[PDB]
Copies of this chain bind each other. A is one copy, B any other.
Amino acid sequence: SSRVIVHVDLDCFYAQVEMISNPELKDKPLGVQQKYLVVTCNYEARKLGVKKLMNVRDAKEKCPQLVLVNGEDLTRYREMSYKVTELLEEFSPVVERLGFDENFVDLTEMVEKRLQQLQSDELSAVTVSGHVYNNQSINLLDVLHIRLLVGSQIAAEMREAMYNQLGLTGCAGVASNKLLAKLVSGVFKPNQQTVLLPESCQHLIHSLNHIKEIPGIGYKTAKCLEALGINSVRDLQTFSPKILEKELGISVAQRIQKLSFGEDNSPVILSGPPQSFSEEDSFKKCSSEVEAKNKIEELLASLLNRVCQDGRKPHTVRLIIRRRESRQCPIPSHVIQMTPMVDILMKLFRNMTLLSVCFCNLK
């Protein structure tokens, strides 16, 4: 029932794609520009004082010597994301994606293969690759330790294979479940990998500086918790289970309190092909008229430049706004094998600072 999971995380991802979509961006302070905000920055830009999601005013005032490229189209980032997943699936079929720049892999079949291609002295060579968290000694007699180094060497290959093949540097974190693997990967922040052996566990949850840093405890679940006298991870651990049941509910409170201890029971989900393809247009309360039309038309050009890909096609259409609301309905089947579409999306709008079109229910 103990596992080995690894968690692979692409570095300043959108920007690292850019330094390969244009070699001249190397050793330059690069930021990626989305409306009037820098969405992410390469490690030259981050030490000149540019910060992720700090306005592009102060991006150019802490670093008026910053270079910028556009990030309002995602295409190159997304393609380069799926080559990452694809590459990791070459190591194991079960890979779970998480946004464009993280992935998990269950290594427990592949660790249990690699321990049965070792005679005695290959086992005596079972070292760590990368760092160990909280600089913990390894008792190479604890099979949980043994397995959690076999997985870390596997993690090295995934990272070097990403480099030698795809050209991406990225961090990896190995640990007995998706949660501790996700928190340990970020520890040694530039390009490297870190493995959480079992006794290090509590040292990684109490190192957090607010329960919002817990994977899965979000914006609303922090508000509720903070209005109960729960701020520290240990508050959330020691708090009454029943009172948590009945302010947050049975599904949340069982889940997030079990998180605070470092527990995560969920398996690695083979994401496979995506569920949906969608696009967004933010504006400063600009759309105030049925020129909602234009952005609906404009968002549907790219979407039809997308939902002809990967050999599948959509059956439902959804229009999302914040004048969130959504209206959806099935695409009339004769359209599935532009413009008549547009009037469908206006039937959804007329049925109701942002407009979005979304194509899902792919078959």
Contacts and interface: CB of A to CB of B under 8 A. Distances in A.
Interface of A: 245, 249-251, 254-255, 265-266, 329-330, 332-334, 344, 347-348, 351
A251 B330 contact: yes
B251 A329 contact: yes
Nearest to A254: B332
A159 B68 CA distance: 70
Contacts of A265: 333-334
Nearest to A251: B329
A347 B254 contact: no
A221 to B, nearest CB: 15
Given A250-B351, A255-B330, A266-B333, 12 more contacts: A245-B347, A249-B329, A250-B329, A250-B344, A250-B347, A250-B348, A251-B329, A254-B329, A254-B330, A254-B332, A265-B333, A265-B334
Nearest to A264: B333
Contacts of A351: 250
Q: Is chain A's interface secondary structure helix, strand, loop, or mixed overall?
A: helix
Nearest to A263: B333
A266 B363 CA distance: 12
A117 B351 CA distance: 54
Contacts of A250: 329, 344, 347-348, 351
Contacts of A330: 251, 254-255
A164 to B, nearest CB: 36
Contacts of A344: 250
Contacts of A251: 329-330
Nearest to A245: B347
A255 B249 CA distance: 38
Nearest to A337: B1
Contacts of A332: 254
A255 B333 CA distance: 10
A266 B315 CA distance: 11
9 contacts: A245-B347, A249-B329, A250-B344, A250-B347, A250-B348, A251-B329, A251-B330, A265-B333, A266-B333
Contacts of A348: 250
A341 to B, nearest CB: 13
Nearest to A266: B333
A328 to B, nearest CB: 8
Nearest to A316: B251
